[PDB]
Amino acid sequence: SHMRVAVADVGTNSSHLLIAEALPGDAGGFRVIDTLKDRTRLGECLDTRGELTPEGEERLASALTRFRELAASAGAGDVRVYATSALREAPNGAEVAERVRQRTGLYPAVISGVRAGELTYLGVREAVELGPDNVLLDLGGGSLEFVRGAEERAADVLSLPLGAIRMTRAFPEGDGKNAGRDVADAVARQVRELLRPHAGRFAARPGTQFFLSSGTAEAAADAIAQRRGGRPAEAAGGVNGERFTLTELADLLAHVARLRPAQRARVPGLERRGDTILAALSVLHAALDALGAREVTVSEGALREGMLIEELAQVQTFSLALSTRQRSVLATAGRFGVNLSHAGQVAELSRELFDRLLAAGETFPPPARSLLTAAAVLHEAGRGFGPQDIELIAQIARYHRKSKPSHPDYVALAPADRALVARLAGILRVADGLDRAHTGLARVDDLRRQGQGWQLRVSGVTPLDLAGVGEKGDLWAREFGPLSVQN
Ligand SMILES: [Mg+2]
């Protein structure tokens, strides 16, 4: 058997789960085992102050509980969860995310709109045939990402607050005859307003291919196909790779705008989106029209597929850079069943902290880097190394302030090895906190001596990661002096 992995995203409208298995060949690919979508509709559970309600917290917990059960059922174990920037509230995101972590075990890490767009672009890459020059729009309930790239990754990302829920709420629809058309016009003016300053970066040139993802675009492609006399997206197994034109979109929108909100849910393809679909289609049409697009291709791949790709990419990049002996450690860790993505991130952070400390004058014995790397890989387990090295690794990997010296089989290392274990376990614990949310995103920017202590600048950290460093950096402060974490 190979490695089963689980990723999940929490957006404004829905939550998504991907369970997959890595491909043999350390190539970066995967095989899809199962997928799940939960219509969490958190954008409907925001209060007057932009915070998520307890009902919205309940819906979130149910989604992560279903997600975590399916993943454990497949052998996936840990589920990395990213949330878009609006789903978890304007000021209380940290509190909401800690709460669901306590209730379910999974921690929804808020990422930026830019990072969401980059990852979504990778999922699109996994689904469709990108060219040398691609513009992707990803419309959700909260934001719209514009992304331009070539055949492998995003080069430029813009994130605008033009989500289908947000636009539906911002232009309440009247009860008159042209009420739909008026909502669509006003939404179209909001789109141009926010897009005009940066439209050039995403405008059509000869050969530009436009792509659309997420559920609005998927519902639109279905509806347009059935307008050309097609069958529900059941036939043809979905809408992946389907194409449609700006004109067809406009006609769909004209039809939807003439209909009453109730009647839109009886338009074939729109059956599940009647409440937002008018605003959402005005956003797509108005944004594409501003960019000069004439035809699009719809993609069923999106954020969750890009999450899997980035995770496997970080895993195998670390694996390839490792030595023969260290790769054997990673393989052994996998056999025990540890999260290799978490192992690799903690090893990389450990190595980064270790190297900064060396550059700052901290002395370490030659095998120190090698012992820390191996203990980092094995730190969550419930060949080519000497028996002393293995014992050091073991103690680094399983360090706790409370040993009992007199109890039989107590392992008392020589004073120099005692001191080494304590310093390397202090690094390891800080690195472990920096990936406490299991995002793979933390990075060490700088590590400077702050008097008799140190100052550590980090990026890509969630509130849970910073709190973890404060709880686990106690050993570091004892060995290296007080530690302040910033950014
Ligand atoms: Mg850990």
UniProtKB/TrEMBL annotation:
Q: Which residues bind Mn(2+)?
A: 342, 379-380, 432
- Range of residues in the leader sequence: none
> Which residues does the UniProt record annotate as the domain Ppx/GppA phosphatase C-terminal?
325-445
The cross-references to CDD domains, in alphabetical order and at most eight, read: ASKHA_NBD_PPX_GppA, HDc
Q: Which residues bind Mg(2+)?
A: 342, 379-380, 432
Which Pfam families does its entry note? Ppx-GppA, Ppx-GppA_III
GO terms, molecular function:
metal ion binding; pyrophosphatase activity
Q: Which UniProt keywords apply?
A: Hydrolase, Metal-binding
Record-linked InterPro entries = ATPase_NBD (IPR043129), GppA/Ppx_hydrolase (IPR050273), HD/PDEase_dom (IPR003607), Ppx_GppA_C (IPR048950), Ppx_GppA_N (IPR003695), PyroPPase_GppA_Ppx (IPR030673)
What domain of life?
Bacteria
Key word Metal-binding present: yes
Domain Ppx/GppA phosphatase N-terminal stretches:
26-313
What is the designated name of this protein?
Exopolyphosphatase
